[PDB]
């Protein structure tokens, strides 16, 4: 994606009803800090999910160690909060060639103060004035009270510890809902056990000229046996004897 927001207004994208391309995640290998939880990253290729939350933002190259489930520091204190029990992966890399610009990057922001620690996964777009001391400022700025938000300072003149990371966080769950997001060569005329689309049986699969209507799946015979099936990957009419 071309434009991640900051951490005070981080973008969240509920994703379901598709398939996971978890291979090139590991084959990317241009990513600085790439960690996971729940069960092993090699294991998560097939072990799949009801409903995932993909939320991303941009933070500093020093504060990214604050991003860890159950730590402290500003980004996890007032900006974006991983829960106490977490499943997903933290994906983190540098985008110094895009974000930090000569003449100064000050598009990005964050919240530096709030009158409590932040509830998990809940953003804070309320840019009203917090009153640290008791003197009421009441919306306008003043004394004992500060502005809530602050920018980052990004230029390519920064060191490597001050480079912008485009941290995308993937979070997962499991429910009464099914695994809506989830990650064998055909043998002709061979007695072969099989499964097509969950349909299971044992037969001799052949080429067959009986002609389906497109939406259809099975064929059947007089006896309510499963007579003929269509190969889902390459549409073809396959008998079952």
């Amino acid at each position: 994606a071309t434009r991640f927001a900051s951490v005070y207004a981080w973008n969240r994208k509920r994703i379901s009803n598709c398939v996971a391309d978890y291979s090139v995640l590991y084959n990317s290998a241009s990513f600085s800090t790439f960690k996971c939880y729940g069960v092993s990253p090699t294991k998560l290729n097939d072990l799949c999910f009801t409903n995932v939350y993909a939320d991303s933002f941009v933070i500093r190259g020093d504060e990214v160690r604050q991003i860890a489930p159950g730590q402290t520091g500003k980004i996890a204190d007032y900006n974006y909060k991983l829960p106490d029990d977490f499943t997903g992966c933290v994906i983190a890399w540098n985008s110094n060639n895009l974000d930090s610009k000569v003449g100064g990057n000050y598009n990005y922001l964050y919240r530096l103060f709030r009158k409590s620690n932040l509830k998990p996964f809940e953003r804070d777009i309320s840019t009203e004035i917090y009153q640290a001391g008791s003197t009421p400022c009441n919306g306008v700025e003043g004394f004992n009270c500060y502005f809530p938000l602050q920018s980052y300072g990004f230029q390519p003149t920064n060191g490597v510890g001050y480079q912008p990371y485009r941290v995308v966080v993937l979070s997962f769950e499991l429910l009464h809902a099914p695994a809506t997001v989830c990650g064998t060569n055909l043998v002709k005329n061979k007695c072969v056990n099989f499964n097509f689309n969950g349909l299971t049986g044992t037969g001799v699969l052949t080429e067959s000229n009986k002609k389906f209507l497109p939406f259809q799946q099975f064929g059947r015979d007089i006896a309510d046996t499963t007579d003929a099936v269509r190969d889902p990957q390459t549409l073809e009419i396959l008998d079952i004897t």
């Epitope: 990317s28 241009s30 790439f34 996971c36 990253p41 160690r65 860890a68 159950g70 510890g161």
Partner: antibody, heavy 119, light 106 residues
Framework: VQLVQSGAEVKKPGATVKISCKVS????????IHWVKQAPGKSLEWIGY????????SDNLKFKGAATLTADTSTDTAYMELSSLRSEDTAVYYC?????????????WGQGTTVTVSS | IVLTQSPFQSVSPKEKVTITCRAS??????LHWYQQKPDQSPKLLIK???QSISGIPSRFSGSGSGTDFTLTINSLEAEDFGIYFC?????????FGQGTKLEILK
């Protein structure tokens, strides 16, 4: 200052080996841990890095041993479980202390732990 | 994102040797150089490709240009030599140097 690695292993193919990297001499939650293999006659190979305070697995697929690293924070130990041992999994296993921040050296190591996978 | 090293480097005491770490396509400036004594844990010679860890004598340097990263040691001694490594930086996994065995003649 001290990463002490459990004794060498010898396991039959397809079996499992979990090797421990015990820590002392620094602050164990202030540093990530890399696990590095080196085969016979061959080079260093990084299998994964872990976090002491949380999961940190970013296992390069490389040889797929379903590898999982676990930190036992009480003893300041890091663990490496390697299953489906294969005839080329016979190699020395280094654990490598990394910085908690995005910096990633290994200045201090364990001594290596040889695992032989042979029928 | 794979790095390439030269297999063996043959020099003598007092001469300077340069052992490249050459990464396909983009490089990250940071790099980590490793001295492996036979059957001994490689020790990190160069961190960040601009600095050497404490106690490492000053003949040891590291650097990079373009897609290259050189391990360059001046005034060699017969005590010193050993197989040299680099480590890639970031980019998901770090590919460690194939290794280059430093021989010193004379």
């Amino acid at each position: 200052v001290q990463l002490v690695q459990s004794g060498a292993e010898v396991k039959k193919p397809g079996a499992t080996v979990k090797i421990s990297c015990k820590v002392s001499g620094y602050s164990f939650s202030n540093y990530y841990i890399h696990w590095v293999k080196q085969a016979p006659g061959k080079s260093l190979e990084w299998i994964g890095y872990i976090d002491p305070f949380n999961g940190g697995t970013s296992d390069n697929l490389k040889f797929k041993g379903a590898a999982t690293l676990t930190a036992d924070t009480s003893t300041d130990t890091a663990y490496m479980e390697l299953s489906s041992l294969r005839s080329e999994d016979t190699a020395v296993y280094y654990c490598a202390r990394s910085e908690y921040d995005p910096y990633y050296v290994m200045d201090y190591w364990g001594q290596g732990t040889t695992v032989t996978v042979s029928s | 994102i794979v790095l390439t090293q030269s297999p063996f480097q043959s020099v003598s005491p007092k001469e300077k040797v340069t052992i490249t770490c050459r990464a396909s396509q983009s490089i990250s400036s940071n790099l980590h150089w490793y001295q492996q004594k036979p059957d001994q844990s490689p020790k990190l010679l160069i961190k960040y490709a601009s600095q050497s860890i404490s106690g490492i004598p000053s003949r040891f340097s590291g650097s990079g240009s373009g897609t290259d990263f050189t391990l360059t040691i001046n005034s060699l001694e017969a005590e010193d030599f050993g197989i040299y490594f680099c480590q890639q930086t970031n980019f998901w996994p770090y590919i460690f140097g194939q290794g280059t065995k430093l021989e010193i003649l004379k």
